[PDB]
Symmetry: D3
Subunit: 257 residues, 6 copies
């Protein structure tokens, strides 16, 4: 068991643990406590012996527009203490939940993802797209922040170093063509952008077919070995990213933007 969250649901269907972002009217923008809740759902999936795949699905036109700004609120003895509790803690936890996850993590990209949400997409093992209008945007340079959610490692790993610099330094999107040219997207479903619900069902239908006849413990044993290629780099980056962001928050520049 776990508390209910009106913005994120989950369910289990056979070997699939399915997480669903269900706040399309706000483009599935997520507050700090929602990122924590995502980590807690990954923990549930990770401990469930019948689960082999964790599938993240969303709703409406965006996968997620990223961290919900409105959050702010109004209690802490310093600006540092405040940002350690609100930003550092949450980022280090949810990023670690993705990095360490032992089940096969699949993202169903129904639209654009931005910011920390787009970082989490880049931490997934497999990504499927609704159509060719999807993109990922990491607007750190425009917001006065730095890399988050393991993007320091994942973006050069999955898109190449030179491409990563052009996108990050100048606040440009990783568009569909860049995703395709780097094999980031394993299948494009070519469905209308209004059709996230049908897209999500179609991915699960194909997954049910694809797992027939496989020995699912092999999937997990192979993931365990594959994860060892970059696990150290991801764990180092996570700690450094969250601690180096603090000067940007405490300076105040992101609040201005």
């Amino acid at each position: 068991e776990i508390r209910q969250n009106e913005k994120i649901s989950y369910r289990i269907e056979g070997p699939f643990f399915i997480i669903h972002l269900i706040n399309p009217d706000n483009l599935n923008a997520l507050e700090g406590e929602d990122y924590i809740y995502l980590g807690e759902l990954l923990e549930l999936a990770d401990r469930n012996r019948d689960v082999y795949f964790t599938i993240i699905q969303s709703s409406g036109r965006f996968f997620s527009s990223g961290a919900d700004f409105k959050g702010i609120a109004k209690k802490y003895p310093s600006e540092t203490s405040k940002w350690v509790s609100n930003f550092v803690a949450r980022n280090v936890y949810v990023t670690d939940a993705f990095i360490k996850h032992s089940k096969v993590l699949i993202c169903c990209l129904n639209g654009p993802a931005i910011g920390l949400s787009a970082a989490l997409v880049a931490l997934c093992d497999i990504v499927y797209s609704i159509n060719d209008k999807v993109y990922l945007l990491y607007p750190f340079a425009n917001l006065g922040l730095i890399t988050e959610g393991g993007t320091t490692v994942s973006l050069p790993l999955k898109f190449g170093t030179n491409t990563t610099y052009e996108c990050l330094m100048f606040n440009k999107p990783f568009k569909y063509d860049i995703m395709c040219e780097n094999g980031f997207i394993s299948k494009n479903f070519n469905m209308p952008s209004s059709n996230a619900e049908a897209f999500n069902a179609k991915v699960l239908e194909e997954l049910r077919e694809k797992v027939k006849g496989l020995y699912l413990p092999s999937c997990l044993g192979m993931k365990k070995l594959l994860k060892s290629n970059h696990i150290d780099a991801f764990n180092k980056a996570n700690s450094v990213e969250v601690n180096e962001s603090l000067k940007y928050w405490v300076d105040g520049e992101p609040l201005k933007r």
Copy 2:
């Protein structure tokens, strides 16, 4: 000198040590002792001061359909002792022979490669294809096994992480288009699939031309430096892969499949 093997021949032509898989009627399926023999041939090439390139060629419609199942046979005090001797020993040795090889390793891909044979293809420095119908298949999830022959490292390195997951988790081939898009194949010769013999000769003809005027010790000096990028990762993966496979063999699941 070395014993003769009716399934694998070798010869030396100038700076080229040429290994030839010559059992096309059985799709060049290899038994454990044949993988060991391949390692022994690599050792011969590696110690020969006149050799600068080790070229692996095959015959018929397949490069190699992988490990020969028929092997089985019928002596060991436990299932563990049996699999240590038959699987662990052989895999750790032939994989190491490829990883450490100091001469430029070139694979002439005359058709599909499967399993451990396809792992060895991914350990080569340069790969040439007969035509666009070649593929590599790593059927570990269908066989109830895990990554072998350094594929834990080589597949993400040469095909990208997300692509590797889609292929390995779901037992899908790395097809020609994926090989091309990742620069895995350096030249496609576009010859008919029946023509492995002519393909093999044509590769060697072009190689004779390409080495004219080069200082061949530079080739080896550059390889020695390039190998240092991933040598530690490959050596770590080899040990872990062979030892982690044992539970899959001892459990018995692969024997069923």
Copy 3:
């Protein structure tokens, strides 16, 4: 301040430190002291708190034809002492200046680059091309040398391992199509090959536009994290490359070629 160099100029325009190779009649071939001067200019840019981007531009039909052979000259107690002073010292210094540079390094590729110059291009963060006729050539195998300027790491990182072997082992160029397929070039300006001057101005015009509204310290903070992915590998390669080249120089083979 710094001494003047008739072959290389520099200037500062806002957040841009601009280095210009200005010897088109000799294809911007560089002598040892010119590589050192490039390192000294990078040091100036690196220490200047108003500089966020270091832009390297050239002139005429070549970006740079590489190390200037004529150099030779005619004083050293041994061949080793001579090559330590003339080759090892200079390479280890200029390569380190590129590896450690904290500002965003952008290369404006107005034509082909060869040898050590082409290595430096591969160390830049972002590369823009004048048109599709550019290429990089690393002629080490024809010259009787080995990898230089961090190419041991940069070429497999940015072009893939198998491609790198085909190019380096056989003295073949990394052509435009290979650069494009690996995302090495962030934008091709598609201008006539005679038009380096207009190309250079156009890149700076677009850069002025692209930085509007960005928090430039974020660019540097992100680079600092991204650089940590491969900094150890580059520093190890630099030391090994320069010291392993000595036997090739002292043997005498490169002097013959």
Copy 4:
């Protein structure tokens, strides 16, 4: 520059940034917000161009008895992310990355997270041979914290570290000496940490005469690169792997 804290003071004397734990009646036990305050002070020292050495000094009979166990959330996970994870990752990182020479004046025992911070210092001086470090994780139902995963095997050896951590035994003075953890024992009475503290500073003043202090920092910058990756990896993994121990509830019970 920074808020006041009744339990921790600081001052600058020439090239020395001196942090002083000043709550000897409670054995200098620290709450979560005090560890955060320590990180903030390290940031001040790190950014101060006149500072070359950061010296951490305490008071009374203990250096620090560790986290103060006396010292709104939608779940237990959310609570422990905010109270344990956040604070540990931040103060540990502040020590790991610190660019000034970090010197600990060990006036008595240190326990737990405080003792982890002592093991992150570059140089340690002891008041006398009664000092020890205790990492009581096995008795509390916790795991390694504050980079001890890396620092203890590095500075005390692997086999020694297992005997001490697995069985909740102290790293005593003799073990510290035999591994060169303590650079000097001042052999002074435990009833006067104030004199000890002053004597260390007096000897530091003498030792820096004639040195080019930027060389000290340049050397530290290179030396730190030997294990910086390992420490950063350990920090993320330690804080996240502890959560199951807190959320289980076992530490609350102990």
Copy 5:
């Protein structure tokens, strides 16, 4: 659960999985299939949810004199892959990856591959000051085995390791002590390994009282990550690089 082996017994007592080498008349020399059996026992202990400590004990005057030299193939390479490579990579990996706390009760000397396994244990207790470890690779015409490439410099220092390995000299008790390799010397007569073994278990029982044993395993899991990559790399390279020494024939001659 597993076949019987006349030379090696095992039993479980509470949280302790106890492996006992019981062939004192042959100094507990082990054949290839016995090293494989040891790996199989470690796998049993590793998978047993009630086990927290794996204790390796022996008998008589030696812990183990190493590989038993008293103890069908198309080539010499094929033979040595099956007899040496396979067995060494498997038993070494079993030790490297083991998740339970591994304790060695050193009742006398250990030699060769057996002494490599002692250096892979987390904690080592000695019967008395007459124990030593000998790695006679240079005299046998072999190279490092059982992860000694990593473990010996890690636990004894690099310079010491070179003096011992290059010149076929023992790591004696004083060297073990000075490096903290031995956590406790029991100072008991060599004529009674049985009493030593019982005394170690008695003290372990006392030491675990009041501890949360899952913390022991959680801490080991983190500590192991410091050198796990190095050990796995060394294991593959050691076994494969030995082949030229066996296939040359030089060890057969010595």
Copy 6:
């Protein structure tokens, strides 16, 4: 084979390549071209198939007082690249990569870059307990050189290394002993380095009897892999980061 050098001789005796520093009147201080010559001699030894051990011996009261400060460029940077960077990266690399067993006969103190080379040797023997190593970088306005960034913490411990380097203090005999840096102290009078040198060679001759010498090299090849990456990284970074200290001018002033 190689030019003569009045300050450094060499000879081969069986499996031993013996390098002898022979300028005791100037405490065997070495100029830049002499460090280059040392690298060239190591290359000779490394390529000689009959050589298994490279032994470095000196003369008089000092092993070496370090770089000789008594001992055309368009800039200060160009000058220091040619005179300091080039020479340091080359001789340090020669030591790091050397495939033969490197033994240092420490007849007296070593300072600076010479003392860095001593810390790169595989085995060190001392004439008596008066030897020390001094790395006076903080007093000279320089930083670590010759791989000391890695070797000193590795062989003496991190905390000890900081006390010595930050405060320009010697690594004395007792510190060398306690860390096992010295494999044997010969306890001979300082007035006869020649006898010391001969005695070391006599004992080496005895110790190699019955050994398969290719095993020594095979073992070194594996042992070297533990830290080779760290040493190569440190070498590039040390030489390049020193430049600002030389170009500033601070060392010239000291």
